[PDB]
Each structure stands twice: as C-alpha cells, then as structure tokens.
Amino acid sequence: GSIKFRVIFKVTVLSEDEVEVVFEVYLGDELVVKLVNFVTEYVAPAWTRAVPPEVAEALRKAVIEWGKGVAELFKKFVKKYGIPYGSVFEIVIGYDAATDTSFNEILVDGKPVISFDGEKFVVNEGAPKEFEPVVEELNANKELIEGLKFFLNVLGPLAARRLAAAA
C-alpha cells in the first residue's frame, strides 16, 4: 500500500534576522503534515488516524526545538559568513520500511555541496571552499547533530511505520 516516507525541511533566509522554516511530511506522494514557521498549516486525516496524540505531540515538540535551533544558526551564516539573502538550505530525510533503511539528501540553493554521512556534515568533492566554515559550524553544534541523527534513525522511522500501518 504506500511505504514511501519523506520529510522535507527547508530554511529560506529573508533577512539577517528573519528566516522562513518549512517542514513537510509525505507518505507516498501525499502531503500529510505542513508546518510553516512552526505553525501547523495542514494536517491530513492520514496523520491523525495513524499517530497517537501523545506521540504526535512529542514529534511536534522535537521538530520545533530542533528547527528553531537550526533557524538561529542560519541567521548567523547570513549575518557573519555573508551567505546571500534568499539562500535556501534544504534537508530531505526518508525511510524505507521494506529494507529498514534511512537516507538524507541535502541541497544548498539547489546544489549538492554538503552531505551528512550519518554522524557529521562534510563538504563534498569539488564543492566551493566557502562551505568549509559552514560545515565546521554545523558540526560544532552537537545538539543539532544529535537531533538530526535521532530523527534519521528513530523518530522518522517511527512515524513512517505508523503512517504505513494505517494506510
């Protein structure tokens, strides 16, 4: 029945003190949750029937905590590192129940210049040297790293399985 699970996390810098933070949850091709600036803008029946309230509340708390952290750090990349306004940082996480495997894909302004290997960020081969300080600042934030690992390996799979089992 569909077992394709993805979460899209996007930060768009609007100004040195303003970012737009978007979280989208997909089961197959269907959007089931959308948060914009931490405001719940859409929740599908597929989500509410699948995820118990106590669990949904823990997941929401987790995303908001981590997302606000990432937002704050991105405010600094623009003010300090001169990253342009309108820059987009996107992370896709996915989970396949058929193989019990997680994955992530990262784009900076639509480009694969950074990856996350399960433990840390790395600047990919051939990518601009100006990403080295950013990756350093990412890996320095041990809470951000711990949180991403916990989403990849624990909370994303947990939500995925609930959604699949109710579809």
PDB file of C-alpha atoms in Angstrom:
ATOM      1  CA  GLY A   1       0.000   0.000   0.000  1.00  0.00           C
ATOM      2  CA  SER A   2       2.392   3.184   0.068  1.00  0.00           C
ATOM      3  CA  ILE A   3       5.545   2.815   2.200  1.00  0.00           C
ATOM      4  CA  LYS A   4       7.395   5.829   0.771  1.00  0.00           C
ATOM      5  CA  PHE A   5       8.128   8.255   3.634  1.00  0.00           C
ATOM      6  CA  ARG A   6       9.855  11.656   3.274  1.00  0.00           C
ATOM      7  CA  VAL A   7      10.296  14.726   5.382  1.00  0.00           C
ATOM      8  CA  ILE A   8      11.411  17.967   3.789  1.00  0.00           C
ATOM      9  CA  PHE A   9      12.953  20.654   5.951  1.00  0.00           C
ATOM     10  CA  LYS A  10      13.648  23.997   4.254  1.00  0.00           C
ATOM     11  CA  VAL A  11      15.134  27.261   5.618  1.00  0.00           C
ATOM     12  CA  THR A  12      14.956  30.322   3.372  1.00  0.00           C
ATOM     13  CA  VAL A  13      16.785  33.385   4.587  1.00  0.00           C
ATOM     14  CA  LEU A  14      14.740  36.557   4.037  1.00  0.00           C
ATOM     15  CA  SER A  15      16.912  38.938   6.087  1.00  0.00           C
ATOM     16  CA  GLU A  16      19.720  38.798   8.659  1.00  0.00           C
ATOM     17  CA  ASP A  17      17.125  38.282  11.426  1.00  0.00           C
ATOM     18  CA  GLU A  18      14.289  36.559   9.511  1.00  0.00           C
ATOM     19  CA  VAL A  19      14.049  33.071   8.080  1.00  0.00           C
ATOM     20  CA  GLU A  20      11.165  31.054   6.701  1.00  0.00           C
ATOM     21  CA  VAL A  21      11.217  27.488   8.085  1.00  0.00           C
ATOM     22  CA  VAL A  22       9.093  24.878   6.352  1.00  0.00           C
ATOM     23  CA  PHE A  23       8.507  21.263   7.372  1.00  0.00           C
ATOM     24  CA  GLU A  24       6.608  18.958   5.004  1.00  0.00           C
ATOM     25  CA  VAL A  25       5.780  15.299   5.687  1.00  0.00           C
ATOM     26  CA  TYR A  26       4.906  12.941   2.817  1.00  0.00           C
ATOM     27  CA  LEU A  27       3.534   9.399   2.665  1.00  0.00           C
ATOM     28  CA  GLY A  28       3.925   8.312  -0.934  1.00  0.00           C
ATOM     29  CA  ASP A  29       3.134  11.379  -2.982  1.00  0.00           C
ATOM     30  CA  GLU A  30       0.680  12.749  -0.405  1.00  0.00           C
ATOM     31  CA  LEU A  31       1.439  15.704   1.869  1.00  0.00           C
ATOM     32  CA  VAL A  32       0.190  14.730   5.328  1.00  0.00           C
ATOM     33  CA  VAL A  33       1.649  17.488   7.544  1.00  0.00           C
ATOM     34  CA  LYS A  34       2.863  21.020   6.828  1.00  0.00           C
ATOM     35  CA  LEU A  35       4.400  23.424   9.365  1.00  0.00           C
ATOM     36  CA  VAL A  36       5.306  26.975   8.267  1.00  0.00           C
ATOM     37  CA  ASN A  37       7.381  28.990  10.765  1.00  0.00           C
ATOM     38  CA  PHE A  38       6.382  26.363  13.371  1.00  0.00           C
ATOM     39  CA  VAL A  39       2.625  26.994  12.782  1.00  0.00           C
ATOM     40  CA  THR A  40       0.658  23.883  11.844  1.00  0.00           C
ATOM     41  CA  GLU A  41      -0.912  24.860   8.489  1.00  0.00           C
ATOM     42  CA  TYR A  42      -2.129  21.419   7.364  1.00  0.00           C
ATOM     43  CA  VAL A  43      -2.750  18.041   8.955  1.00  0.00           C
ATOM     44  CA  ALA A  44      -4.248  15.231   6.845  1.00  0.00           C
ATOM     45  CA  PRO A  45      -6.609  12.581   8.194  1.00  0.00           C
ATOM     46  CA  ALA A  46      -3.888  10.034   7.267  1.00  0.00           C
ATOM     47  CA  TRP A  47      -1.741  11.556  10.022  1.00  0.00           C
ATOM     48  CA  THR A  48      -4.315  11.928  12.812  1.00  0.00           C
ATOM     49  CA  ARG A  49      -5.616   8.371  12.338  1.00  0.00           C
ATOM     50  CA  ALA A  50      -2.070   6.934  12.312  1.00  0.00           C
ATOM     51  CA  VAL A  51      -0.197   8.738  15.084  1.00  0.00           C
ATOM     52  CA  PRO A  52      -1.473   8.724  18.703  1.00  0.00           C
ATOM     53  CA  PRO A  53      -1.805  12.290  20.211  1.00  0.00           C
ATOM     54  CA  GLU A  54       0.858  11.624  22.867  1.00  0.00           C
ATOM     55  CA  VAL A  55       3.270  10.581  20.099  1.00  0.00           C
ATOM     56  CA  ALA A  56       2.307  13.364  17.723  1.00  0.00           C
ATOM     57  CA  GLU A  57       2.907  15.911  20.490  1.00  0.00           C
ATOM     58  CA  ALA A  58       6.380  14.537  21.221  1.00  0.00           C
ATOM     59  CA  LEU A  59       7.201  14.627  17.498  1.00  0.00           C
ATOM     60  CA  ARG A  60       5.943  18.197  17.140  1.00  0.00           C
ATOM     61  CA  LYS A  61       7.997  19.301  20.180  1.00  0.00           C
ATOM     62  CA  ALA A  62      11.072  17.599  18.727  1.00  0.00           C
ATOM     63  CA  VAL A  63      10.748  19.282  15.266  1.00  0.00           C
ATOM     64  CA  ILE A  64      10.048  22.714  16.698  1.00  0.00           C
ATOM     65  CA  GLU A  65      13.020  22.523  19.172  1.00  0.00           C
ATOM     66  CA  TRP A  66      15.478  21.344  16.507  1.00  0.00           C
ATOM     67  CA  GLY A  67      14.082  23.600  13.773  1.00  0.00           C
ATOM     68  CA  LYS A  68      14.284  26.747  15.883  1.00  0.00           C
ATOM     69  CA  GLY A  69      17.946  25.844  16.684  1.00  0.00           C
ATOM     70  CA  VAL A  70      18.808  25.412  13.002  1.00  0.00           C
ATOM     71  CA  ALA A  71      16.998  28.695  12.249  1.00  0.00           C
ATOM     72  CA  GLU A  72      19.123  30.585  14.767  1.00  0.00           C
ATOM     73  CA  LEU A  73      22.332  29.151  13.309  1.00  0.00           C
ATOM     74  CA  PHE A  74      21.258  30.083   9.768  1.00  0.00           C
ATOM     75  CA  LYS A  75      20.658  33.662  10.944  1.00  0.00           C
ATOM     76  CA  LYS A  76      24.395  33.682  11.724  1.00  0.00           C
ATOM     77  CA  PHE A  77      25.533  32.227   8.393  1.00  0.00           C
ATOM     78  CA  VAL A  78      23.908  35.190   6.671  1.00  0.00           C
ATOM     79  CA  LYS A  79      24.972  37.953   9.063  1.00  0.00           C
ATOM     80  CA  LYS A  80      28.507  36.606   9.574  1.00  0.00           C
ATOM     81  CA  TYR A  81      29.501  34.481   6.593  1.00  0.00           C
ATOM     82  CA  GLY A  82      27.836  36.720   4.005  1.00  0.00           C
ATOM     83  CA  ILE A  83      25.631  33.938   2.632  1.00  0.00           C
ATOM     84  CA  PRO A  84      23.225  35.770   0.276  1.00  0.00           C
ATOM     85  CA  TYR A  85      19.649  36.719   1.109  1.00  0.00           C
ATOM     86  CA  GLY A  86      17.147  34.284  -0.445  1.00  0.00           C
ATOM     87  CA  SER A  87      19.566  31.407   0.134  1.00  0.00           C
ATOM     88  CA  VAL A  88      17.798  28.077   0.704  1.00  0.00           C
ATOM     89  CA  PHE A  89      19.101  25.209   2.881  1.00  0.00           C
ATOM     90  CA  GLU A  90      17.056  22.033   2.431  1.00  0.00           C
ATOM     91  CA  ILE A  91      17.313  18.604   4.048  1.00  0.00           C
ATOM     92  CA  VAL A  92      15.221  15.642   2.849  1.00  0.00           C
ATOM     93  CA  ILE A  93      15.076  12.614   5.144  1.00  0.00           C
ATOM     94  CA  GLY A  94      13.464   9.381   4.053  1.00  0.00           C
ATOM     95  CA  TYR A  95      12.755   5.942   5.441  1.00  0.00           C
ATOM     96  CA  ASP A  96      12.020   2.719   3.500  1.00  0.00           C
ATOM     97  CA  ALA A  97      10.257   0.115   5.668  1.00  0.00           C
ATOM     98  CA  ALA A  98      10.889  -2.646   3.099  1.00  0.00           C
ATOM     99  CA  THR A  99      14.664  -2.500   3.716  1.00  0.00           C
ATOM    100  CA  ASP A 100      14.677  -0.703   7.127  1.00  0.00           C
ATOM    101  CA  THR A 101      16.931   1.969   5.700  1.00  0.00           C
ATOM    102  CA  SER A 102      17.066   5.720   6.213  1.00  0.00           C
ATOM    103  CA  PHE A 103      18.662   8.282   3.914  1.00  0.00           C
ATOM    104  CA  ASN A 104      19.131  12.034   3.669  1.00  0.00           C
ATOM    105  CA  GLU A 105      19.712  14.445   0.755  1.00  0.00           C
ATOM    106  CA  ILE A 106      20.934  17.992   1.327  1.00  0.00           C
ATOM    107  CA  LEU A 107      20.701  20.951  -1.059  1.00  0.00           C
ATOM    108  CA  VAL A 108      22.125  24.472  -0.642  1.00  0.00           C
ATOM    109  CA  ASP A 109      20.478  26.754  -3.227  1.00  0.00           C
ATOM    110  CA  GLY A 110      19.580  23.641  -5.125  1.00  0.00           C
ATOM    111  CA  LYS A 111      23.176  22.305  -5.175  1.00  0.00           C
ATOM    112  CA  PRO A 112      24.642  19.131  -3.563  1.00  0.00           C
ATOM    113  CA  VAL A 113      27.638  20.915  -1.977  1.00  0.00           C
ATOM    114  CA  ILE A 114      27.247  19.385   1.532  1.00  0.00           C
ATOM    115  CA  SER A 115      26.248  15.897   2.733  1.00  0.00           C
ATOM    116  CA  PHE A 116      25.516  14.277   6.115  1.00  0.00           C
ATOM    117  CA  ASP A 117      27.108  10.859   6.480  1.00  0.00           C
ATOM    118  CA  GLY A 118      25.095   9.662   9.459  1.00  0.00           C
ATOM    119  CA  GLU A 119      27.462  11.202  12.041  1.00  0.00           C
ATOM    120  CA  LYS A 120      28.658  14.550  10.614  1.00  0.00           C
ATOM    121  CA  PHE A 121      28.402  17.074   7.804  1.00  0.00           C
ATOM    122  CA  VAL A 122      31.064  17.038   5.105  1.00  0.00           C
ATOM    123  CA  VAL A 123      31.872  19.343   2.190  1.00  0.00           C
ATOM    124  CA  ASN A 124      31.569  17.198  -0.917  1.00  0.00           C
ATOM    125  CA  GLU A 125      34.322  16.791  -3.516  1.00  0.00           C
ATOM    126  CA  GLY A 126      34.685  19.783  -5.831  1.00  0.00           C
ATOM    127  CA  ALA A 127      32.312  21.957  -3.799  1.00  0.00           C
ATOM    128  CA  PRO A 128      33.206  25.604  -3.005  1.00  0.00           C
ATOM    129  CA  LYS A 129      35.792  26.103  -0.278  1.00  0.00           C
ATOM    130  CA  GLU A 130      33.471  28.678   1.334  1.00  0.00           C
ATOM    131  CA  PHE A 131      31.377  25.785   2.696  1.00  0.00           C
ATOM    132  CA  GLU A 132      34.221  24.601   4.954  1.00  0.00           C
ATOM    133  CA  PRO A 133      33.400  27.175   7.741  1.00  0.00           C
ATOM    134  CA  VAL A 134      29.687  26.356   7.496  1.00  0.00           C
ATOM    135  CA  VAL A 135      30.238  22.597   7.873  1.00  0.00           C
ATOM    136  CA  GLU A 136      32.550  23.363  10.823  1.00  0.00           C
ATOM    137  CA  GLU A 137      29.813  25.486  12.432  1.00  0.00           C
ATOM    138  CA  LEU A 138      27.241  22.757  11.779  1.00  0.00           C
ATOM    139  CA  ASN A 139      29.427  20.016  13.295  1.00  0.00           C
ATOM    140  CA  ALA A 140      30.254  22.266  16.249  1.00  0.00           C
ATOM    141  CA  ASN A 141      26.536  22.336  17.193  1.00  0.00           C
ATOM    142  CA  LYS A 142      26.390  18.951  18.951  1.00  0.00           C
ATOM    143  CA  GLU A 143      22.639  19.320  19.725  1.00  0.00           C
ATOM    144  CA  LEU A 144      21.816  19.926  16.006  1.00  0.00           C
ATOM    145  CA  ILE A 145      23.836  16.802  15.036  1.00  0.00           C
ATOM    146  CA  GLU A 146      22.366  14.624  17.814  1.00  0.00           C
ATOM    147  CA  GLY A 147      18.864  15.777  16.832  1.00  0.00           C
ATOM    148  CA  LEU A 148      19.326  15.011  13.144  1.00  0.00           C
ATOM    149  CA  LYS A 149      20.663  11.544  13.973  1.00  0.00           C
ATOM    150  CA  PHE A 150      17.686  10.927  16.241  1.00  0.00           C
ATOM    151  CA  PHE A 151      15.233  11.977  13.503  1.00  0.00           C
ATOM    152  CA  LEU A 152      17.017   9.858  10.876  1.00  0.00           C
ATOM    153  CA  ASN A 153      17.296   6.698  12.921  1.00  0.00           C
ATOM    154  CA  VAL A 154      14.437   6.838  15.464  1.00  0.00           C
ATOM    155  CA  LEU A 155      11.622   9.399  15.034  1.00  0.00           C
ATOM    156  CA  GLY A 156      11.340   9.449  11.215  1.00  0.00           C
ATOM    157  CA  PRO A 157      11.150   5.600  11.050  1.00  0.00           C
ATOM    158  CA  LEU A 158       8.658   5.533  13.966  1.00  0.00           C
ATOM    159  CA  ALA A 159       6.311   7.974  12.198  1.00  0.00           C
ATOM    160  CA  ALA A 160       6.822   6.205   8.854  1.00  0.00           C
ATOM    161  CA  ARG A 161       5.783   2.867  10.257  1.00  0.00           C
ATOM    162  CA  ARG A 162       2.688   4.308  11.930  1.00  0.00           C
ATOM    163  CA  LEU A 163       1.610   6.060   8.732  1.00  0.00           C
ATOM    164  CA  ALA A 164       2.193   2.904   6.611  1.00  0.00           C
ATOM    165  CA  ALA A 165       0.241   0.658   9.047  1.00  0.00           C
ATOM    166  CA  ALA A 166      -2.795   2.968   8.908  1.00  0.00           C
ATOM    167  CA  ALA A 167      -2.886   3.371   5.054  1.00  0.00           C
TER     168      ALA A 167
END
